[PDB]
Amino acid sequence: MRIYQCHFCSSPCYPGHGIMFVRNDAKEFRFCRSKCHKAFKQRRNPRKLKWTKAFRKAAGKELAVDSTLTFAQRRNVPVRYNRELVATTLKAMARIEEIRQKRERAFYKNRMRGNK
Amino acid sequence: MATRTQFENSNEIGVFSKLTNTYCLVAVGGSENFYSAFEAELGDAIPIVHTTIAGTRIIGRMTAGNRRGLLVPTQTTDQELQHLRNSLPDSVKIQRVEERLSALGNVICCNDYVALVHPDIDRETEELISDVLGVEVFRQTISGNILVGSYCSLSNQGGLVHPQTSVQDQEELSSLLQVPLVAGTVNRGSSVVGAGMVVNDYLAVTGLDTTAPELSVIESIFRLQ
Amino acid sequence: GHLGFLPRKRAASIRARVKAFPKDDRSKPVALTSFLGYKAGMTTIVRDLDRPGSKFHKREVVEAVTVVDTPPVVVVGVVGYVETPRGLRSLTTVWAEHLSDEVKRRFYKNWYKSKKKAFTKYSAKYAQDGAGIERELARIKKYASVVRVLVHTQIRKTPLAQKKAHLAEIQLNGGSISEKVDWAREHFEKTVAVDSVFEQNEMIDAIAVTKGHGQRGYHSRTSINHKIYRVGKGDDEANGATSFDRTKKTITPMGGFVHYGEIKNDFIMVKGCIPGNRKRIVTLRKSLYTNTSRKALEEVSLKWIDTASKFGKGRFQTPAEKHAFMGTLKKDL
Amino acid sequence: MQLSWKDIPTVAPANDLLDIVLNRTQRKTPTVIRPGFKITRIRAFYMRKVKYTGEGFVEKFEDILKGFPNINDVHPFHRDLMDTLYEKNHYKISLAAISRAKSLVEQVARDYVRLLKFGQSLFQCKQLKRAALGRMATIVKKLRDPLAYLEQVRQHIGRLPSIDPNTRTLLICGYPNVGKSSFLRCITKSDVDVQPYAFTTKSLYVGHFDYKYLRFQAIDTPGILMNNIEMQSIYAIAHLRSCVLYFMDLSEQCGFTIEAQVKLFHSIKPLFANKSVMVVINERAQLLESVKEVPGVEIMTSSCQLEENVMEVRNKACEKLLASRTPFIPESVKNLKKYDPEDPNRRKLARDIEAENGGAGVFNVNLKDKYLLEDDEWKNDIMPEILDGKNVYDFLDPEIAAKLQALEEEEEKLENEGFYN
Amino acid sequence: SWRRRDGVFLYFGVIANPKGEMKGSAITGPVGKECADLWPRVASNSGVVV
RNA sequence: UGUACAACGGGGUAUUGUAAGCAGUAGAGUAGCGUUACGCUGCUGAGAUUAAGCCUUUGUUGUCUGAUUUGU
RNA sequence: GCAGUCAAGCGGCGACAUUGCUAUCAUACCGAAGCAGAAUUCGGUAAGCGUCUACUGAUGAAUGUUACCGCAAUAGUAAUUGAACUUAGUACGAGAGGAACAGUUCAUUCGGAUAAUUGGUUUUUGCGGCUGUCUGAUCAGGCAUUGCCGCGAAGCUACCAUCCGCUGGAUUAUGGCUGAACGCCUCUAAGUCAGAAUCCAUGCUAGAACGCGGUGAU
RNA sequence: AGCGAAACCACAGCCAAGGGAACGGGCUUGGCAGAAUCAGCGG
Ligand SMILES: [Zn+2]
């Protein structure tokens, strides 16, 4: 199984949920929830709304692009399998998540500046 | 030398299999006869592993490559990417192609020295083929055919192309591709020769329904003897 | 349509009565013929198809899976049966002198107003030095050829808002009925683990009263080939962590089950849907036969279970994933 | 149809066909009626019964007629061939008689239906139906001889080795039991012998063979010495697009001496010369040399056991009919001996192993040790492939600890820097 | 739409001879698995799979 | 008269798409004589929905006998 | 129907044959065809499935009382067709051609249910904006016995979504053994093997509301 | 909540067969099945 990304919410989506549409252009389009699919059918861009991940992360309301968010990305070439190398993924992903946990809070606090 | 077989009694060998000089790709299922046919002549000197591509049985049309490397379609799941590297030795490169149409058996058809690509193929993989495959790349719609890869098969011994190829074109391809070709038909006169045949420098596989003259012509052009 | 389920008359009791049972086992020891539980709900399962000759061999397959709550069954008595021209007859019955409150309450409808002075004359007699009690066991052993064991659900462990339990008579097939009665007595007041009754890939069948469409439904039903995917334990953390994904989580959907409490006890996953609905008792049996076929011989390859919330839509599987992706909010730091 | 017939429906004898039609009309149609029922209902009942019987008879007759091929319009060669196997005039007369009987049955059924539409009494309708059925049976019953002849013709024609005249064919002619009987068997698969009696080959055997990747076939003449068999053989040799060959024997086979054989051979002069004749022979020299007067022929002495001579003659006949950069290979693959199914020590294919153990496709696919992995100690995998809502495949890379080391200190850098003010 | 074994839905008159060959050499369109896989002959005559 | 019935608050849960207010002076605005009819910023994935048939319960608190017939 | 070699009886008629036009369509244990093989039709068997009375949902005291559990006489009863893998490119067959039993893989058909996703489903009377109504007005959308744009779980709910849908005997026709009758013969009259999709057993449904049994309470 | 009719009523209903013009509903041979009591297939 492979987790894909929705073009509307720009977030991962599990299989067997929402609705999936494939255009004649020979590529797949996914939607986490039926509301996203309906909005995409109406051509309503969410990237200008305060709630969507794309707007929040880029503007400052949420964590922006950072070195931590540079590993969960698809790759074009395969990797040689190794049982020992599997353990590295478990530790590496956990450490990356722990590192990121200390950056989202910092970004939110920076956004909160001036609330005093 | 040449072998006649079928997958599910279907003559579309080129759709359910993709045989190369360094690896063998065939469909999957309980019917091991198709895999056994390749295993017999090929034996064990080269890896013979049946695997799925994008979950479909059209692995033959879905994948393409040569001795230097292997190419797989865009829809190839990341799970199959691990299998691709595990089965093939590290000496053979593996690269995924982001084609417009998810079928390498239609966009790319090549051999150990020359490759034919769709006119609208991505420039990235088009240039990378010169290293992954080590072959020359030419955008050429044979006789105007949009599906270049599904109507021809190529190898260092030559190949069989759709009947629309003129004899003069076949003779010129002896120098344009460094290997002469022959115009013929497979699957009892089917114009789509590449769909029903898979053949390499030392082994040829064709549909059972293929007529004897077609098999003899295929053997002669590939100079097996 | 089908006249076998007509008239459309409601069943007599919510609990589904079990009619048939296997015949006998000449060599194997005493074993439980059936198991019972409660329907926790339904979710989704994805695995890899190892079934031979399949068109989707080694390809992902998705199908609905029901989750059944199966708390450790406890034995509280044994019933002896004797063959008669009129059929099986329960000539004698015996208890264990330590019936739980869950069972004693079932013997009342106004437990609050009841004096609760039940199982006293017999329990006091049972408290004697065996001699009197052993006579019934000897009589059962002398004549009886089929023995049934009374069992009830540990409702206290389940999150249901019910204290009264239910008594179900479960048959045994082990030979030398003396061994059967000896085993039953040795297990009085004891519990039996779920794994000891059923195992993975077993082609068990279940019977339960269907949902009442309201007089449509509410009748007893049966369906064979209710294959169990994976048996889980409440104490064994990471039950929802499949063999492949092994994600640290539990099968309980986020925010609990729809109109049902969170699952925190032993549970079993069964392929496909099942009769009844949430908050309904169900029974499990081995279909009385063996479905010899490659469908049964295959093995489970579970990869992921749908554990998203059922209130509205769902974007996350576990709370640990939500906070990372969603980040903080007004109600947080 | 083509020049081959094996789908002709069986010709039911008049009695058998009549019984079948009677059973069909009795069973399918209703059989319970009373005088107290509606008069219109009884009229409809009788009309339906009569119409069903007539339609069944007509359909059976049409099906019988359509199955048989039209001898006249099939082909002149096949027409002449059938003219000797069966009496062509009798065949046409029988077909015409059957067609006329079918037309008469149709007319009778239509007339009875028209008359029955205005019946006045139930017994009148019953009598009309009885008369119609009796007339149909009587007309059908008289077809016993033509129906028997049609059945015999169908049986005889259902197995003939007929072939298209345009196909390359070889014709062998000669006296009975000359020795050419073994010729066809050697050239093509057939069951014939050189038993020392004249007509060891009564039928016109046909057999296929291949040469120079081109299809060919040969035909053996039953015997030529008017004779019915001789006429039938001639009416196929003359019209077939084939090469006619002659055979001879000295004193043992064929009975007749060389002079008689030469005299018989000269009798086929008017028409045999146009088919590139050749002669094989199983004071006498002059008689044999007399064949040279033909515009072109080849004569060679041989024997029934001279298989190489037969092969050379076949090759010569086929020739006469016809006249009218360097690759790169993984040498390791080709070094291994080619597959030898008969060798018990060969590299048994997965098919054989599965059949021995896994049986048919019921076996399950496995990839144990299939991967070209370095260490076999860990040839078993349970891939996580998903963790914390993220795909493990995006993190599985060789020794990512080196990259993680550069990010480890970023936590301390952020903590002491104080982004949280 | 229709359910796929992969775990996600999918959605977007012609006749052929008994061999499934269409009257064209440059067929194009939404040739899903229902035709790209069911009809291997058509899949070779069709470029845009899925 | 007890890991007992219960009521809110809170959390879990997703949903809508960013509430009323300070007040745009973040910003060109321009009819005058920079002004003023008027020209998405901090709370704010915000407010609310968030079971009269979604889950809980770190739980304090409000509660706990009104009638009945039958018995080898 | 007309005339007749027509002739068992028989008061001059007369069933018998011949001479002139005019309770299955597939689902097959079984046999025949000039059935090499597939296919085919015929006699074969079965209607199994294909092609004011009546309750369809219901209530009430019973057999010391109460509560639990259990047996079953009874009535009903259900799965199913096609396509591929395979023995298969085979037995066979002059060549082209193209079977099956044993095990698997898919969908329509009929039935029992589940909501894992989606929707025809919305009174969360739920939400951001919005119109008539027009709000002292920036507050406020104060109103459409039921509002619009964008959404919505749940109740509902269907391949418009999902899972599932039996294993042993007795027999009809039929193929044999022994064995006569009728010193022979034979399948049958004594018995018996194989064998029906038929019948009964297996299972499921409800359970005599006066069919029954066991247990805690006085 | 309370008031309050009418049509119709020799008496009226568990079925299969015989019952002559067949009307079977009260004659004969057999099989059914609960005092009391909601609600109806599109009869
Ligand atoms: Zn999203």
Side-chain angles (χ1 to χ4, degrees), chain A residues 15-24 26 28 30 37 41, chain E residues 1 4 6-12 29-30 33 48-50:
Chain A
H17 285 295
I19 307 173
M20 193 231 70
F21 168 54
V22 155
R23 197 158 272 283
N24 296 351
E28 309 183 331
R30 294 166 179 282
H37 179 34
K41 277 164 62 168
Chain E
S1 64
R4 294 162 41 189
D6 291 341
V8 76
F9 309 124
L10 168 63
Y11 72 100
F12 310 141
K33 267 93 82 174
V48 192
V49 173
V50 178

Coordinates of all heavy atoms in Angstrom, one line a residue, chain A residues 15-24 26 28 30 37 41, chain E residues 1 4 6-12 29-30 33 48-50:
Chain A
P15 N -6.4 5.1 1.5 CA -7.3 4.5 0.5 C -8.6 4.2 1.2 O -8.8 4.1 2.4 CB -6.6 3.3 0.0 CG -5.2 3.4 0.6 CD -5.2 4.2 1.8
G16 N -9.6 4.0 0.3 CA -10.9 3.6 0.8 C -11.7 4.7 1.5 O -12.6 4.4 2.3
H17 N -11.4 6.0 1.2 CA -12.1 7.1 1.8 C -12.2 8.2 0.8 O -11.4 8.3 -0.2 CB -11.3 7.6 3.0 CG -11.4 6.8 4.2 ND1 -12.6 6.6 4.9 CD2 -10.5 6.1 4.9 CE1 -12.4 5.8 5.9 NE2 -11.2 5.4 6.0
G18 N -13.2 9.0 0.9 CA -13.5 10.1 0.0 C -13.8 9.6 -1.4 O -14.4 8.5 -1.5
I19 N -13.5 10.4 -2.4 CA -13.8 10.1 -3.8 C -12.6 10.4 -4.6 O -11.8 11.3 -4.3 CB -15.0 10.9 -4.3 CG1 -16.2 10.7 -3.4 CG2 -15.3 10.5 -5.7 CD1 -17.4 11.6 -3.8
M20 N -12.4 9.6 -5.6 CA -11.2 9.7 -6.5 C -11.7 9.9 -7.9 O -12.6 9.2 -8.4 CB -10.3 8.5 -6.4 CG -8.9 8.6 -7.0 SD -8.6 7.3 -8.2 CE -9.7 7.7 -9.5
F21 N -11.1 10.9 -8.6 CA -11.4 11.2 -10.0 C -10.2 11.1 -10.8 O -9.1 11.7 -10.5 CB -12.1 12.6 -10.1 CG -12.2 13.1 -11.5 CD1 -12.8 12.4 -12.5 CD2 -11.7 14.4 -11.8 CE1 -12.9 12.9 -13.8 CE2 -11.8 14.8 -13.1 CZ -12.4 14.1 -14.1
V22 N -10.3 10.5 -12.0 CA -9.2 10.4 -13.0 C -9.7 11.1 -14.3 O -10.6 10.7 -14.9 CB -8.8 9.0 -13.3 CG1 -8.2 8.8 -14.7 CG2 -7.9 8.5 -12.2
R23 N -9.0 12.2 -14.6 CA -9.3 12.9 -15.9 C -8.7 12.2 -17.1 O -8.0 11.2 -17.0 CB -8.7 14.4 -15.8 CG -9.3 15.3 -16.8 CD -9.1 16.8 -16.4 NE -10.2 17.2 -15.5 CZ -11.4 17.6 -16.0 NH1 -11.7 17.5 -17.3 NH2 -12.4 18.0 -15.1
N24 N -9.2 12.6 -18.3 CA -8.7 12.0 -19.5 C -7.2 12.3 -19.7 O -6.7 11.6 -20.6 CB -9.5 12.6 -20.7 CG -11.0 12.2 -20.6 OD1 -11.4 11.4 -19.8 ND2 -11.8 12.8 -21.5
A26 N -4.8 11.2 -18.2 CA -4.0 10.1 -17.8 C -3.2 10.3 -16.5 O -2.0 9.9 -16.4 CB -3.1 9.6 -18.9
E28 N -4.1 10.6 -12.0 CA -5.1 10.5 -10.9 C -5.2 11.7 -10.1 O -4.2 12.4 -9.8 CB -4.8 9.3 -10.0 CG -4.5 8.0 -10.8 CD -4.2 6.8 -9.8 OE1 -3.7 7.1 -8.7 OE2 -4.5 5.7 -10.2
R30 N -7.0 12.9 -6.3 CA -7.6 12.3 -5.1 C -8.1 13.5 -4.2 O -7.7 14.6 -4.3 CB -6.5 11.5 -4.3 CG -6.1 10.3 -5.0 CD -4.8 9.7 -4.4 NE -4.4 8.5 -5.0 CZ -4.9 7.3 -4.8 NH1 -6.0 7.1 -4.0 NH2 -4.5 6.2 -5.5
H37 N -13.7 17.2 -3.1 CA -14.1 16.8 -4.5 C -15.1 17.8 -5.1 O -15.0 18.2 -6.2 CB -14.6 15.4 -4.5 CG -15.0 14.9 -5.9 ND1 -14.3 15.3 -7.0 CD2 -15.9 14.1 -6.3 CE1 -14.9 14.8 -8.1 NE2 -15.8 14.0 -7.7
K41 N -14.6 20.3 -8.3 CA -15.5 20.2 -9.4 C -16.0 21.6 -9.7 O -16.2 22.0 -10.9 CB -16.7 19.3 -9.1 CG -16.4 17.8 -9.4 CD -17.5 16.9 -8.8 CE -18.9 17.2 -9.3 NZ -19.8 16.1 -8.9
Chain E
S1 N -19.1 5.5 -10.5 CA -17.8 4.9 -10.5 C -17.8 3.4 -10.1 O -18.9 2.8 -9.9 CB -16.9 5.6 -9.4 OG -17.4 5.5 -8.1
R4 N -12.2 -0.6 -7.0 CA -11.0 -1.3 -7.5 C -10.4 -2.0 -6.3 O -10.5 -1.6 -5.1 CB -10.0 -0.3 -8.0 CG -10.4 0.4 -9.3 CD -9.5 1.7 -9.5 NE -8.1 1.5 -9.2 CZ -7.2 2.5 -9.2 NH1 -7.6 3.7 -9.5 NH2 -6.0 2.2 -8.8
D6 N -7.4 -2.2 -5.5 CA -6.4 -1.4 -4.9 C -6.9 -0.6 -3.6 O -6.1 -0.3 -2.8 CB -5.8 -0.4 -5.9 CG -5.0 -1.1 -7.0 OD1 -4.6 -2.3 -6.7 OD2 -4.7 -0.5 -8.0
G7 N -8.2 -0.3 -3.6 CA -8.7 0.4 -2.4 C -9.2 1.8 -2.7 O -9.3 2.6 -1.8
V8 N -9.5 2.1 -4.0 CA -9.9 3.5 -4.4 C -10.8 3.4 -5.6 O -10.7 2.5 -6.4 CB -8.7 4.4 -4.6 CG1 -8.1 4.1 -6.0 CG2 -9.2 5.9 -4.5
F9 N -11.8 4.3 -5.7 CA -12.7 4.3 -6.8 C -12.1 4.9 -8.0 O -11.0 5.5 -8.0 CB -14.0 5.1 -6.4 CG -14.6 4.7 -5.1 CD1 -14.8 5.7 -4.1 CD2 -15.0 3.4 -4.9 CE1 -15.4 5.3 -2.9 CE2 -15.6 3.0 -3.7 CZ -15.8 4.0 -2.7
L10 N -12.7 4.6 -9.2 CA -12.2 5.1 -10.4 C -13.3 5.3 -11.4 O -14.3 4.5 -11.5 CB -11.2 4.1 -11.0 CG -10.8 4.3 -12.5 CD1 -10.0 5.6 -12.7 CD2 -9.9 3.2 -13.0
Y11 N -13.3 6.5 -12.1 CA -14.3 6.8 -13.1 C -13.7 7.8 -14.1 O -12.8 8.6 -13.7 CB -15.6 7.2 -12.5 CG -15.5 8.6 -11.9 CD1 -16.0 9.7 -12.6 CD2 -15.0 8.8 -10.7 CE1 -16.0 11.0 -12.1 CE2 -14.9 10.1 -10.1 CZ -15.4 11.2 -10.8 OH -15.4 12.4 -10.3
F12 N -14.3 7.9 -15.3 CA -13.8 8.8 -16.3 C -14.5 10.2 -16.1 O -15.7 10.2 -15.9 CB -14.1 8.3 -17.7 CG -13.6 6.9 -17.9 CD1 -14.3 6.0 -18.7 CD2 -12.4 6.5 -17.4 CE1 -13.9 4.7 -18.9 CE2 -11.9 5.2 -17.6 CZ -12.7 4.3 -18.3
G29 N -8.0 7.6 -26.1 CA -9.1 7.9 -25.2 C -8.8 7.3 -23.8 O -7.7 6.8 -23.5
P30 N -9.9 7.3 -22.9 CA -9.8 6.7 -21.6 C -9.9 5.2 -21.6 O -10.9 4.6 -21.3 CB -10.9 7.4 -20.8 CG -11.9 7.7 -21.9 CD -11.2 7.9 -23.2
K33 N -8.5 -0.1 -17.3 CA -8.1 -1.5 -17.2 C -9.2 -2.4 -17.7 O -9.0 -3.6 -18.0 CB -7.9 -1.8 -15.7 CG -6.4 -1.7 -15.3 CD -6.1 -0.4 -14.7 CE -6.4 -0.2 -13.3 NZ -6.0 1.1 -12.7
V48 N -3.3 5.8 -24.9 CA -3.5 6.4 -23.6 C -4.2 5.3 -22.7 O -5.4 5.3 -22.7 CB -4.4 7.7 -23.7 CG1 -4.4 8.4 -22.4 CG2 -3.9 8.5 -24.8
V49 N -3.4 4.5 -22.0 CA -3.9 3.6 -21.1 C -4.3 4.3 -19.8 O -3.6 5.2 -19.3 CB -2.9 2.5 -20.8 CG1 -3.3 1.6 -19.6 CG2 -2.5 1.7 -22.0
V50 N -5.5 4.0 -19.3 CA -6.1 4.6 -18.1 C -6.2 6.1 -18.4 O -7.2 6.6 -18.9 CB -5.2 4.3 -16.9 CG1 -5.8 5.0 -15.7 CG2 -5.1 2.8 -16.6

